[PDB]
Write a protein that binds this ligand. Structure first.
Ligand SMILES: O=c1ccn([C@@H]2O[C@H](COP(=O)(O)OP(=O)(O)O[C@H]3O[C@H](CO)[C@@H](O)[C@H](O)[C@H]3O)[C@@H](O)[C@H]2O)c(=O)[nH]1
Length: 444
């Protein structure tokens, strides 16, 4: 029996892509052991009931956990030192056992895993869970052709679309952490010469030339995305309808005409100012369109006093909906999104045009691609003070849903939905790369 280790960065948020991929290759006959922390274990559903259910391997005791007193660097140092030792102790046992793992697939944000696998002679590959475009940016910042402060007004990287400085990832939200975050992202490409493969959460038709550029770094690149549940695409893997509730959103959507509703989500981790949140709320109201806005309790409290009351007819403002179920609903014609890589891929897979309102990090670069490269929507015009007016919000929504290019966006959205599904369906670019990896694993 062939089994591998999957070791994603242990944070609630980014372990889903690796789990989604795990489902693909559990279906192709590969057993998977999830390597994770005590903490993740407690907040994760306990081990499945089947023979080929993902096996949970807790290798830490909790002392790696970040402290309230820590700087990000200090948190990262303690995490690396302790988890290095933990992995070493784990493989010391696992490698000399009757069925030793054949591979370790680890999040690219933990490059020190490769050095541990190298010691044990264990086949290994990083997994880049963000866009291939970000791989190009972070690589070029590592090698010095791009600086943390852009040195020019237009950035023209090989095989990339032209980028303004405003299109580049902005990690200066916490200036204290900015240096540490840039170091972490650039260190993802330092030791790739010893990686068996480089896995990427994307597909060939979405970033084909960028992927071809990455292949010139000397290693086999395997595009295996998008990691959205099969049920919303090729529908070939049993269940796989969610990542890793009683819904009202679906009934409310059922009464609305096809393609008429704006789904609003500016991210489940993004905080927003009362000022900007007021302009956004009023801007959505001014369009006069049916809208479903999912915003969490702490964010929902910062809305204008009578806002929810005032949109009793057109607006459904709720604490939570199944984003995948809402996007797949035929009444939803447009998605106001913060352009997180997961939201971005979900919009493309479900063939829904976007009103892009990026906030931080890779969202800025994802927005650029959605508007100028994939052409499935528009970015809300910002101010000189980075504040979007309710008029800028209203016009952007109208232009995407009712403007000159409205039909272009939906047509392009349906094309990407087709191509995303084709990539993960039998014989697709992603399915082929996954079959190759599986075949390689059965060769030992
Ligand atoms: O009401 C909601 C909100 C989200 N989701 C799902 O939960 C996941 C997380 O969504 P969200 O956090 O809104 O967006 P992402 O695209 O995952 O963005 C995440 O990852 C990005 C990386 O690009 C970061 O920039 C963002 O801060 C971070 O939220 C996705 O799979 C969504 O489908 C729901 O099911 N319901």
């Amino acid at each position: 029996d062939t089994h591998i280790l999957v070791f994603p960065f242990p944070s609630q948020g980014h372990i889903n892509p690796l789990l989604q991929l795990s489902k693909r290759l559990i279906a192709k006959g590969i057993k998977v052991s999830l390597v994770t922390t005590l903490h993740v274990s407690n907040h994760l559903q306990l081990q499945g009931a089947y023979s080929n259910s993902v096996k949970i391997e807790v290798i830490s005791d909790g002392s790696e956990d970040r402290l309230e007193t820590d700087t990000m660097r200090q948190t990262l140092d303690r995490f690396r030192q302790k988890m290095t030792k933990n992995l070493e102790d784990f493989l010391q046992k696992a490698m000399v056992s009757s069925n030793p793992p054949k591979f370790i697939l680890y999040d690219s944000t933990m490059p020190w895993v490769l050095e541990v696998a190298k010691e044990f002679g264990l086949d290994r590959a990083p997994f880049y869970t963000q866009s291939c475009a970000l791989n190009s940016i972070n690589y070029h910042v590592l090698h010095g052709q791009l600086k943390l402060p852009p040195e020019t007004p237009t950035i023209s990287l090989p095989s990339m679309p032209l980028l303004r400085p405003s299109d580049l990832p902005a990690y200066d939200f916490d200036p204290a952490s900015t240096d540490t975050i840039i170091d972490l992202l650039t260190s993802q490409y330092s030791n790739i010469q010893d990686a068996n493969l480089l896995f990427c959460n994307t597909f060939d038709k979405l970033e084909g030339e960028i992927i071809q550029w990455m292949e010139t770094l000397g290693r086999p690149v395997k595009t295996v995305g998008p990691t959205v549940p099969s049920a919303y695409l090729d529908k070939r893997v049993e269940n796989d309808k969610h990542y890793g509730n009683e819904d009202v959103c679906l009934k409310w959507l059922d009464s609305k005409p096809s393609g008429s509703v704006l789904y609003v989500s500016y991210g489940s981790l993004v905080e927003m100012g009362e000022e900007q949140l007021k302009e956004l709320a009023l801007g959505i109201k001014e369009t006069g369109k049916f809208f479903l806005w999912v915003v969490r309790d702490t964010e929902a409290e910062k809305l204008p006093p009578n806002f929810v009351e005032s949109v009793a007819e057109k607006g459904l403002v709720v604490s939570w909906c199944s984003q995948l179920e809402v996007l797949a609903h035929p009444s939803v014609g447009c998605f106001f999104t913060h352009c997180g890589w997961n939201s971005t891929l979900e919009a493309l897979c479900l063939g829904v045009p976007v009103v892009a309102f990026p906030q931080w990090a890779d969202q800025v670069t994802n927005a650029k691609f959605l508007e100028d490269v994939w052409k499935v929507g528009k970015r809300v015009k910002r101010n000189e003070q980075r504040l979007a007016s309710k008029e800028e919000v209203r016009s952007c929504i109208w232009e995407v849903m009712e403007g000159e290019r409205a039909s272009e966006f939906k047509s392009n959205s349906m094309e990407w939905k087709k191509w995303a599904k084709e990539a993960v369906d039998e014989g697709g670019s992603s399915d082929k790369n996954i079959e190759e990896f599986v075949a390689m694993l059965k060769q030992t």
